[PDB]
């Protein structure tokens, strides 16, 4: 059995009011992954929002570093597969019954020897947040998660409970959509979760700077410079990132053309700066010159 002090949850899922009232139940339910009994905490998210419940053990949380009910990552907040890929992690948690119960037992025994402060294992050795992860991250609280379900009655017409229909009396979503059927077990293990694939395709279609053909094209064109930048400022953007060989600050077009001394240095600089080199608030467009 687990025993906790509070949930460990996403701010989205925790609610809007600063003042929340929440109930605990000791040994209340069984972790859908750890398979063992847990303490279950239940809170009312907001006005006219479903009561939510912590749905995974505190150890099953600390292991993969997620929110015990929202299930999304704690820092960035993407599906577990996406975060794993962006951290280039390879999580080896067993699948079959006996092996998984055994692994859970020993992982719990070893997490007993912790400080309760940070995830155990590679989730400390993989906290180097890649710009892909930061780029996919949610920005404001998608609080549409906490509205109630779809009223089978009010979908057939029957929700004769007036306005109190226990579920959102709107149109039912077409079951063909990939974003419909995502079993909890897979969403925790990260094996074929449709939201992960859609978000990954979105991250693949997202703009990133393109590389040139020729090795000798070592002039990099930064578009959208503005006349509040200095040649020394463009340097400080591309100075310690390697070596720069020359800098042409074109004031007749508000752009720049940086000749470097190391191809990998300039490549890392410009790709890492792609539309996001925000110096004095200017959206520069890093590309390889002609």
């Amino acid at each position: 059995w687990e025993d906790a002090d509070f949930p460990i949850l996403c701010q989205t899922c925790l609610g809007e009011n600063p003042y929340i009232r929440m109930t605990k139940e000791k040994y209340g339910k069984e972790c859908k992954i750890c398979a063992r009994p847990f303490t279950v905490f239940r809170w009312c998210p907001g006005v006219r929002m479903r009561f939510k419940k912590t749905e995974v053990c505190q150890t099953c949380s600390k292991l993969k570093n997620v929110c015990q009910t929202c299930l999304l990552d704690l820092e960035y907040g993407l599906p577990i597969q996406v975060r794993d890929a962006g951290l280039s992690f390879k999580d080896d948690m067993p699948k079959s019954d006996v092996n998984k119960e055994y692994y859970t037992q020993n992982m719990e025994r070893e997490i007993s020897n912790s400080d309760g402060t940070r995830p155990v294992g590679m989730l400390g050795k993989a906290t180097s947040t890649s710009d892909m992860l930061l780029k996919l991250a949610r920005t404001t609280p998608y609080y549409k998660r906490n509205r109630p379900h779809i009223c089978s009655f009010w979908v057939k017409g029957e929700c004769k409970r007036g306005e109190e229909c226990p579920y959102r009396h709107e149109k039912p979503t077409d079951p063909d959509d990939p974003l419909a059927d995502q079993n909890i077990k897979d969403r925790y293990y990260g094996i074929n979760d449709p939201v992960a694939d859609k978000l990954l395709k979105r991250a693949s279609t997202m703009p990133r700077l393109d590389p040139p053909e020729d090795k000798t094209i070592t002039t990099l064109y930064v578009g959208g410079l503005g006349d509040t930048i200095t040649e020394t400022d463009l340097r400080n953007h591309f100075y310690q990132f390697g070596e720069i060989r020359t800098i042409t600050v074109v004031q007749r077009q508000q752009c720049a053309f940086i000749q470097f001394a190391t191809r990998q240095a300039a490549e890392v600089a410009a790709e890492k700066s792609f539309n996001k080199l925000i110096v004095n608030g200017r959206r520069l467009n890093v590309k390889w010159g002609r």
């Binding site: 009232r21 929440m22 109930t23 139940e25 009994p37 006996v98 055994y102 037992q105």
Partner: protein, 49 residues
């Protein structure tokens, strides 16, 4: 700021979960170094004995 209140237990409620699960025992602790005194020799005759 959150208000913890513990939920009532129903007096007439049987246990909820299956306790008896069997698994092999975990790995022990990191083996300690064997601080012996150096071994001596057994002649062939002793092993005959």
């Amino acid at each position: 700021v959150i208000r913890m209140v513990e939920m009532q237990k129903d007096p007439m409620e049987p246990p909820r979960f299956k306790i008896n699960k069997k698994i092999p025992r975990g790995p022990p602790s990191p083996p300690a170094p064997v601080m012996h005194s150096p071994s001596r020799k057994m002649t062939v005759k002793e092993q005959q004995e």
